[PDB]
mmCIF file of C-alpha atoms in Angstrom:
data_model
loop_
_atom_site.group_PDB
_atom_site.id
_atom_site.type_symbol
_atom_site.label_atom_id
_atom_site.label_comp_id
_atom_site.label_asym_id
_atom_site.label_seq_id
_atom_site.Cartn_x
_atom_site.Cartn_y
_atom_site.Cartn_z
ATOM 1 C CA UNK G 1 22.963 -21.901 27.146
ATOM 2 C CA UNK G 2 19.536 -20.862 25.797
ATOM 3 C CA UNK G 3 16.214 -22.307 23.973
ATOM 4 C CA UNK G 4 15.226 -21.148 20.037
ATOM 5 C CA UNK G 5 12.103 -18.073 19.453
ATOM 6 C CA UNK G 6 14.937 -16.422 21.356
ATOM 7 C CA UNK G 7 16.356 -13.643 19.034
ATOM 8 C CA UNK G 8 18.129 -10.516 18.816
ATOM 9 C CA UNK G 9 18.377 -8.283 15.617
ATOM 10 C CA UNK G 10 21.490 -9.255 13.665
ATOM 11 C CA UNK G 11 23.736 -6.842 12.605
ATOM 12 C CA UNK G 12 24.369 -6.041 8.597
ATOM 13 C CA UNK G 13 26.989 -4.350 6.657
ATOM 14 C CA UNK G 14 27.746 -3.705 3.208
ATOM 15 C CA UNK G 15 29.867 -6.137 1.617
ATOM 16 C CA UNK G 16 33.436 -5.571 0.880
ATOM 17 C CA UNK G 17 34.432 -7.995 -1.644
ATOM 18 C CA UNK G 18 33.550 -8.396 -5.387
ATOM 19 C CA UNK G 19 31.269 -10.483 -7.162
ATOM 20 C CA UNK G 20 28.945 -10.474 -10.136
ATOM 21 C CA UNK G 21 26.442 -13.668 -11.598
ATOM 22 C CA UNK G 22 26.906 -12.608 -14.846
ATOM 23 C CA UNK G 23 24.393 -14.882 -16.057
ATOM 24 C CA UNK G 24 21.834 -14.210 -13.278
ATOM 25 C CA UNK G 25 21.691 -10.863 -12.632
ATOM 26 C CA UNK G 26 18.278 -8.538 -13.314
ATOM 27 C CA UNK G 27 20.559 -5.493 -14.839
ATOM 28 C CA UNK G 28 23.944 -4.424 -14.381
ATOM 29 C CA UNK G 29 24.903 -0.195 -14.646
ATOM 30 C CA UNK G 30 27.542 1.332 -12.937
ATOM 31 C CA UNK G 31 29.628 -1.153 -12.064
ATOM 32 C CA UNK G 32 27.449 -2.747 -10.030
ATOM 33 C CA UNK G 33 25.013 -5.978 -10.638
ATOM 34 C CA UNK G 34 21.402 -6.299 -9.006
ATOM 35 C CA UNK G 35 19.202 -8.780 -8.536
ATOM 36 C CA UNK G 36 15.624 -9.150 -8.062
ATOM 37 C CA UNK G 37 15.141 -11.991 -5.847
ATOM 38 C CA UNK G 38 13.133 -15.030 -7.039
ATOM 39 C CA UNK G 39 11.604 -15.904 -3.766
ATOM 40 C CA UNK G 40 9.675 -13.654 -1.602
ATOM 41 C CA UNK G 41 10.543 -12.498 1.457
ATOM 42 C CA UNK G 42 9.186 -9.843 4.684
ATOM 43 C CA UNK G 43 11.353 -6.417 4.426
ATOM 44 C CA UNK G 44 14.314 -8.233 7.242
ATOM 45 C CA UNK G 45 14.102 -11.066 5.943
ATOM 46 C CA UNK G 46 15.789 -9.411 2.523
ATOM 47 C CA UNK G 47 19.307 -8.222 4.763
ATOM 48 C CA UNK G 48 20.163 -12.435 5.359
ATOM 49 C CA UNK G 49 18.379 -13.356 2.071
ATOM 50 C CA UNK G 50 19.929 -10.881 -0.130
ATOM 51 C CA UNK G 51 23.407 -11.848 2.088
ATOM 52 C CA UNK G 52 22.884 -15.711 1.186
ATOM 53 C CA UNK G 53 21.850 -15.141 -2.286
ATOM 54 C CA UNK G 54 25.044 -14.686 -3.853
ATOM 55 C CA UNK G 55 28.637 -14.054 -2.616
ATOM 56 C CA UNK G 56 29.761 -10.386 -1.979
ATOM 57 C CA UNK G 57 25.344 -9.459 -2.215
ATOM 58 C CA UNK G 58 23.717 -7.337 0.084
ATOM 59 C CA UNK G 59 20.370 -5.773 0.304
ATOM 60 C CA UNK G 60 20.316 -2.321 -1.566
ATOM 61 C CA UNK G 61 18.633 1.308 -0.806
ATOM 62 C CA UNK G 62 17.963 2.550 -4.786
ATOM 63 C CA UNK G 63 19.755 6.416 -4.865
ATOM 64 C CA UNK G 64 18.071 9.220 -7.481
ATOM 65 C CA UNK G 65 19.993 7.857 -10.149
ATOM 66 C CA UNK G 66 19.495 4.385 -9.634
ATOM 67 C CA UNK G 67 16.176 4.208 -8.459
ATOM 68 C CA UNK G 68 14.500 4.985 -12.514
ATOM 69 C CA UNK G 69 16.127 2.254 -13.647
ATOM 70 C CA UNK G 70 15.255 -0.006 -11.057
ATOM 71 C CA UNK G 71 11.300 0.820 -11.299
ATOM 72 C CA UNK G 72 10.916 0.360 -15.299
ATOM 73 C CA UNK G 73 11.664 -3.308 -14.683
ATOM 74 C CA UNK G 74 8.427 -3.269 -12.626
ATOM 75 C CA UNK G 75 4.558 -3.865 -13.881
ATOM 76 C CA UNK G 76 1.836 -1.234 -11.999
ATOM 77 C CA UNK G 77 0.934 -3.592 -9.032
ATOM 78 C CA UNK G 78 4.717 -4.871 -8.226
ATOM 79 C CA UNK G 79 6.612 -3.923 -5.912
ATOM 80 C CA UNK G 80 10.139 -4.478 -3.878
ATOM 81 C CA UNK G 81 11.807 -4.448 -0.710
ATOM 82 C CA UNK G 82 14.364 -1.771 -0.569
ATOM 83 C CA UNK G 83 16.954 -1.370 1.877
ATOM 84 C CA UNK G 84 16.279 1.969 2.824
ATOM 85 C CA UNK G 85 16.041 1.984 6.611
ATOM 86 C CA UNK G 86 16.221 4.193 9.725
ATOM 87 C CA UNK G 87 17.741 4.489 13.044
ATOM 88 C CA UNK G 88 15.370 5.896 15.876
ATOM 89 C CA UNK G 89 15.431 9.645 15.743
ATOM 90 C CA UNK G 90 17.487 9.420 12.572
ATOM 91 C CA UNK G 91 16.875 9.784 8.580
ATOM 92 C CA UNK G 92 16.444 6.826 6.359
ATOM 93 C CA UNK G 93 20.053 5.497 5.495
ATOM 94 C CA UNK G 94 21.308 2.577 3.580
ATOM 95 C CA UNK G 95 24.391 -0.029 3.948
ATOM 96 C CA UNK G 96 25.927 2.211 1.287
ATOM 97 C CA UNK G 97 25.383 5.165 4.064
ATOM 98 C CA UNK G 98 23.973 8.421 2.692
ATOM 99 C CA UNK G 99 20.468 10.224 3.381
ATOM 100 C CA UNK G 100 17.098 8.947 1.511
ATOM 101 C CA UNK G 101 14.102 11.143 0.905
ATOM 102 C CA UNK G 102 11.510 8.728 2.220
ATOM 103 C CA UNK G 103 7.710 9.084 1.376
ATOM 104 C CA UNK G 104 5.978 8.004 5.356
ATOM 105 C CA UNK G 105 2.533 6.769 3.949
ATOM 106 C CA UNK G 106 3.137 4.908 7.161
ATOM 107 C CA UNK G 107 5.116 5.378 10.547
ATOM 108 C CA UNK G 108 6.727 2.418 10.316
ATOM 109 C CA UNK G 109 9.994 1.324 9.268
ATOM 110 C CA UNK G 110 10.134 -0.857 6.136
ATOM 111 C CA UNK G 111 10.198 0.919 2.918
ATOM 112 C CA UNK G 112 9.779 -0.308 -0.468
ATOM 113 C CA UNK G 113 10.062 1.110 -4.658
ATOM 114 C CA UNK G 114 7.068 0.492 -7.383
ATOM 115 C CA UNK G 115 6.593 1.077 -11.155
ATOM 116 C CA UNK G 116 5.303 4.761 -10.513
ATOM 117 C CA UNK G 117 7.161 5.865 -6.918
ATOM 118 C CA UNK G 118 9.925 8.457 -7.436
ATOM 119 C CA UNK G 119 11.752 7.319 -3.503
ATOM 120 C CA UNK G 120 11.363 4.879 -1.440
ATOM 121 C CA UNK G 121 7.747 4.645 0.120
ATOM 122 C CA UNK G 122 7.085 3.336 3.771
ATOM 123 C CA UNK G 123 4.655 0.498 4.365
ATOM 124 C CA UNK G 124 1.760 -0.441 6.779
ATOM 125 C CA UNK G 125 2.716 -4.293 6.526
ATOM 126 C CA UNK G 126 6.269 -5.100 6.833
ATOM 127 C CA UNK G 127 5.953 -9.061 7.236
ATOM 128 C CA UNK G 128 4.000 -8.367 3.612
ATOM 129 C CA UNK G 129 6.508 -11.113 1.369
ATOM 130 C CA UNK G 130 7.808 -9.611 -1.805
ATOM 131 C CA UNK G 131 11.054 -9.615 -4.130
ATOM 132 C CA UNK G 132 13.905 -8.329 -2.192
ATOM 133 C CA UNK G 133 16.021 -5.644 -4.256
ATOM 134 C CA UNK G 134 20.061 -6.833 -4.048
ATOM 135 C CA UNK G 135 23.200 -5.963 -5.369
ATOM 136 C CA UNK G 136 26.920 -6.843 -5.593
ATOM 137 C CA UNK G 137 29.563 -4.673 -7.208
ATOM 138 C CA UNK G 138 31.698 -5.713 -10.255
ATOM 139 C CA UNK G 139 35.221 -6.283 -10.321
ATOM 140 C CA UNK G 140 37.631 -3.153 -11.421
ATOM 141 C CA UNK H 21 -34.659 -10.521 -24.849
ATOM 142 C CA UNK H 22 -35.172 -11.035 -21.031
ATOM 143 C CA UNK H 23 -38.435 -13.012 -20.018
ATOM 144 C CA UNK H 24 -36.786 -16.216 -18.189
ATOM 145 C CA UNK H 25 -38.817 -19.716 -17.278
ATOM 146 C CA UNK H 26 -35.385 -20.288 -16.094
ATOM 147 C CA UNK H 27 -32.089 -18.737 -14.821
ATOM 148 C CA UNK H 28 -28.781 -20.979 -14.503
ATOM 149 C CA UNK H 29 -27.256 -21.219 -11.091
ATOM 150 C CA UNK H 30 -23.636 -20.434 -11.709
ATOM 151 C CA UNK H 31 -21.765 -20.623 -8.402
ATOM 152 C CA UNK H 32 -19.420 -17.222 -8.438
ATOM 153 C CA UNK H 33 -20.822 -15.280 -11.321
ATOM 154 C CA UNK H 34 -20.990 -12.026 -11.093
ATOM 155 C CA UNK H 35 -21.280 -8.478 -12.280
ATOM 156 C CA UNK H 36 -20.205 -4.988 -10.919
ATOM 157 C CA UNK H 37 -23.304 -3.844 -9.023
ATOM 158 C CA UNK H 38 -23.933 0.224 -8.944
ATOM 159 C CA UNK H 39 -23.803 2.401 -6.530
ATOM 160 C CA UNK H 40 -25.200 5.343 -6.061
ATOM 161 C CA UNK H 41 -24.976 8.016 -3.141
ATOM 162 C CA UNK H 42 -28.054 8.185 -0.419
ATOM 163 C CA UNK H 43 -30.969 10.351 -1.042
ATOM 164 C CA UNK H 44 -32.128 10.003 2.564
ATOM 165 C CA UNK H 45 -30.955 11.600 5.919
ATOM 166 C CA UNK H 46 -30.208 9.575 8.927
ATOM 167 C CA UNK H 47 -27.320 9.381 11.310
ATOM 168 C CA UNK H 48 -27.158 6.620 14.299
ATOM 169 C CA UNK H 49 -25.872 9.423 16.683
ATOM 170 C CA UNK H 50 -25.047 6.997 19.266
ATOM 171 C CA UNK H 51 -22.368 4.970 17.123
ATOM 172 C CA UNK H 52 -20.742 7.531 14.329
ATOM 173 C CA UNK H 53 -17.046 7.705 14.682
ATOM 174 C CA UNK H 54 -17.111 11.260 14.663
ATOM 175 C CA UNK H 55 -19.802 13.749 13.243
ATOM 176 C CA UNK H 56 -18.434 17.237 10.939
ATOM 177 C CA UNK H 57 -20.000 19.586 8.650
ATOM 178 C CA UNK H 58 -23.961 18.328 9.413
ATOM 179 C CA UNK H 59 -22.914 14.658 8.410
ATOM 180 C CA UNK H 60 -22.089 11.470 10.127
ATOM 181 C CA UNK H 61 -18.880 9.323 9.577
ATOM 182 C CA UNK H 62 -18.645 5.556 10.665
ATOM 183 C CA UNK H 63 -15.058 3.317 10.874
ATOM 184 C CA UNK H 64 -16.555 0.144 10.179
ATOM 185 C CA UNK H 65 -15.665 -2.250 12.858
ATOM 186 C CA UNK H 66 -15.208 -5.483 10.643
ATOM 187 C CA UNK H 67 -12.521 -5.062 7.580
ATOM 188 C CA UNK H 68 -13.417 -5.758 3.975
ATOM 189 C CA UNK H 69 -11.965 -5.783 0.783
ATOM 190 C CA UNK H 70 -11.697 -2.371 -1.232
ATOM 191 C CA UNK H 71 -15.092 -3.021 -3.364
ATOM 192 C CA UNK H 72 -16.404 -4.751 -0.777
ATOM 193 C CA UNK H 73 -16.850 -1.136 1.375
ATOM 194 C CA UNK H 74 -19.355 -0.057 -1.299
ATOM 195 C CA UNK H 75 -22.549 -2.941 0.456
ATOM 196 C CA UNK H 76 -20.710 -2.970 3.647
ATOM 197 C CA UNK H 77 -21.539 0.550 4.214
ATOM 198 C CA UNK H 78 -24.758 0.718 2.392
ATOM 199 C CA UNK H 79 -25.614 -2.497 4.891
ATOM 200 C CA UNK H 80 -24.407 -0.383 7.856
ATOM 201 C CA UNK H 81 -26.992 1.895 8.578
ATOM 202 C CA UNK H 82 -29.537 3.476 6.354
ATOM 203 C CA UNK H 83 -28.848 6.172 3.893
ATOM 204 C CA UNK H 84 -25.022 5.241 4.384
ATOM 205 C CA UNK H 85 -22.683 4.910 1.673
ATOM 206 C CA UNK H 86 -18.889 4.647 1.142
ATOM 207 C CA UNK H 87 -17.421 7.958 1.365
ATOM 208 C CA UNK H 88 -13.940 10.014 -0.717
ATOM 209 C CA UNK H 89 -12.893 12.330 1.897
ATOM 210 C CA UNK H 90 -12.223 15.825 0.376
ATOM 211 C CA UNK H 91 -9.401 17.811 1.401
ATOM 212 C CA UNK H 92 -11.438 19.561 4.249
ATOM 213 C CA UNK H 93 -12.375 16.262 5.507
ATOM 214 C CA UNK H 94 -9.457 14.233 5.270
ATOM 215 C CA UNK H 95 -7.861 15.913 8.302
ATOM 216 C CA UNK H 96 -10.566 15.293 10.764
ATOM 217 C CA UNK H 97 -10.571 11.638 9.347
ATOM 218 C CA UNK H 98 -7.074 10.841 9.559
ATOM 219 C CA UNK H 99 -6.394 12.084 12.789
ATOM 220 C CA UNK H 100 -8.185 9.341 14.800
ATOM 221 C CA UNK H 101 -5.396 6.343 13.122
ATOM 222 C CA UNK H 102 -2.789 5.441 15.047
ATOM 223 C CA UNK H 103 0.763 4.910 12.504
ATOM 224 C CA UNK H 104 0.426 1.631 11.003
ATOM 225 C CA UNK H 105 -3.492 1.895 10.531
ATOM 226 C CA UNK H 106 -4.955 3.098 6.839
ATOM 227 C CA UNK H 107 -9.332 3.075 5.679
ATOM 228 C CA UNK H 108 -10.602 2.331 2.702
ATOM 229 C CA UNK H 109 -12.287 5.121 1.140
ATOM 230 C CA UNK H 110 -14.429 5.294 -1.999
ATOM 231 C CA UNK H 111 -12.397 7.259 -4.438
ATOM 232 C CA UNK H 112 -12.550 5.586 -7.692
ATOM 233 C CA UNK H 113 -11.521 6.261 -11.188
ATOM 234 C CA UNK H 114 -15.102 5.671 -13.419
ATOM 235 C CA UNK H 115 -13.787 4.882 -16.743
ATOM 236 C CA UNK H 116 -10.387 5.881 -18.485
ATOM 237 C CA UNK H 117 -11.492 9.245 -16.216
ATOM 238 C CA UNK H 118 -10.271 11.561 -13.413
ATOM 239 C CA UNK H 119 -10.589 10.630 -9.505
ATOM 240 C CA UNK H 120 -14.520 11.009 -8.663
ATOM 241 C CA UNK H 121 -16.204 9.852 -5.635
ATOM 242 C CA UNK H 122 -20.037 9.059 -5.015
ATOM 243 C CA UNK H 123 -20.580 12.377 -4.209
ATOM 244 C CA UNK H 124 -18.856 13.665 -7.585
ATOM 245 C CA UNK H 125 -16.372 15.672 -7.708
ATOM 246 C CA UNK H 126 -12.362 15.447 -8.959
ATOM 247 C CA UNK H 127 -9.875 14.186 -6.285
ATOM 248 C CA UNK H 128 -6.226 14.212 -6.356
ATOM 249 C CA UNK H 129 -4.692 10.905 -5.774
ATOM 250 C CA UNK H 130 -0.783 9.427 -4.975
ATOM 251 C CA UNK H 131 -1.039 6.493 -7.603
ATOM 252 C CA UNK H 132 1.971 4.622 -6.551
ATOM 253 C CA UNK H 133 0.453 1.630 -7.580
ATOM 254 C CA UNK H 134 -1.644 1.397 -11.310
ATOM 255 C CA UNK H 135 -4.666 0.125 -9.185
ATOM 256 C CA UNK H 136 -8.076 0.945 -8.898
ATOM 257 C CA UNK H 137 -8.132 0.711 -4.726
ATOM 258 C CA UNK H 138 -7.455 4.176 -2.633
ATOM 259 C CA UNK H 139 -7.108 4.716 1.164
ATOM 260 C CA UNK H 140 -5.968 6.969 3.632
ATOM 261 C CA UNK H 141 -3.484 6.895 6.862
ATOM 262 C CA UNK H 142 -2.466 8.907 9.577
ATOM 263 C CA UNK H 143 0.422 10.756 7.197
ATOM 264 C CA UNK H 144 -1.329 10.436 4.118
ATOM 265 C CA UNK H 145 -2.369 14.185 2.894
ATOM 266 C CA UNK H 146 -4.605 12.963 0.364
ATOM 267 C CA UNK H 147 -5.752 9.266 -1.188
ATOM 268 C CA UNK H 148 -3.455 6.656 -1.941
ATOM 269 C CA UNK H 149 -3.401 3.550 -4.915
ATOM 270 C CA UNK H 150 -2.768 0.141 -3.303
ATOM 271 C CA UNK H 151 -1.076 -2.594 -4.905
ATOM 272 C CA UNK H 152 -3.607 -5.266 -3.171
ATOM 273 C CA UNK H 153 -7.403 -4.436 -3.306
ATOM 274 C CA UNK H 154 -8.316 -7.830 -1.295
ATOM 275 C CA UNK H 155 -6.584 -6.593 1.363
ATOM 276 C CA UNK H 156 -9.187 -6.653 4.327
ATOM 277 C CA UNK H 157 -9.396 -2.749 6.105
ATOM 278 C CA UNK H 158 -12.270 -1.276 7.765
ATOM 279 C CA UNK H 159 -14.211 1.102 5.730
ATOM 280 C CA UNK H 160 -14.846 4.665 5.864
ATOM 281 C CA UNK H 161 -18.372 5.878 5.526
ATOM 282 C CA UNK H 162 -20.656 8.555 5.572
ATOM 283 C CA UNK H 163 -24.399 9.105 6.011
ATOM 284 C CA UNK H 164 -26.313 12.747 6.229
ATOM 285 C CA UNK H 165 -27.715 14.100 9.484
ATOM 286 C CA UNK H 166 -31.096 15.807 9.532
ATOM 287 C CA UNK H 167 -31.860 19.165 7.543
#
């Protein structure tokens, strides 16, 4: 009983099942299989997209570890989407949970990883469409 | 060499023009954004491109020219932006070189980005690389007030 434009924010959680395109993925390490999405998309927009791009996917906050290895896959003007995200008064957190060290360029609440960053890096333009940074986790 | 009877008209060619700093002293002391250290600094009202800062601020006023803020400065400046809002400034890299600005010097800058654009924001402690130099911000400028 209600008219479209109308919205709420949708609720995301890490996914618990596993799945790996073996033939599609960026890189695989770990265990786990991320992708790089082909289509651009604002920093939200990357929780449904990354969700719908492949079963078991969700939209991924890069740790220390996994960040490096992310970034050299990257030329020196692109960038991604990371989901690295935070709630009010609280510290940047992922789907995977944890505590990010977050470089606030900008108070605002997307975040994103480049060639050259060492974290995540907040940014002035959040409806700004870029590559969406994804994972699923392998079968053990 | 150069003695033309005739010059082609080539729609978009171009050239990096030079810039240097102002010789002269002026400030418009009804319109500066705020005024520190016997010189006047201007937030340009309409947004440009990174480059583009260097003639929009020389066109702004006389003896104004796009301005690095220097680590005594860049706290005055970046107070008066609200979270989300950032400036162009001119800090530029000459050649393979070190950080300079107009008024020389050797700046330390966050390269996040491999870029040739820097600004500032309300957070940011000193200049920042940009991945998109088109991206239209106002411009931060300076000009020199009297004696």
């Amino acid at each position: 009983p209600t008219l479209h434009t109308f919205q709420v924010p949708q609720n995301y959680t890490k996914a618990n099942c596993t799945y790996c395109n073996t033939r599609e993925y960026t890189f695989s390490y770990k265990g786990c299989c991320f992708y790089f999405t082909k289509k651009k998309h604002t920093w939200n927009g990357c929780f449904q997209a990354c969700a719908e791009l492949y079963p078991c996917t969700y939209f991924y906050g890069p740790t220390p570890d996994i960040l490096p290895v992310v970034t050299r896959n990257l030329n020196a003007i692109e960038s991604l989407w990371v989901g690295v995200y935070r709630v009010g008064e609280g510290n940047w957190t992922s789907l995977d949970g944890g505590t990010f060290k977050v470089y606030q360029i900008f108070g605002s609440h997307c975040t994103y990883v480049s060639k050259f960053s060492t974290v995540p890096v907040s940014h002035h333009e959040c409806s700004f469409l870029k590559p969406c940074l994804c994972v699923s986790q392998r079968s053990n």
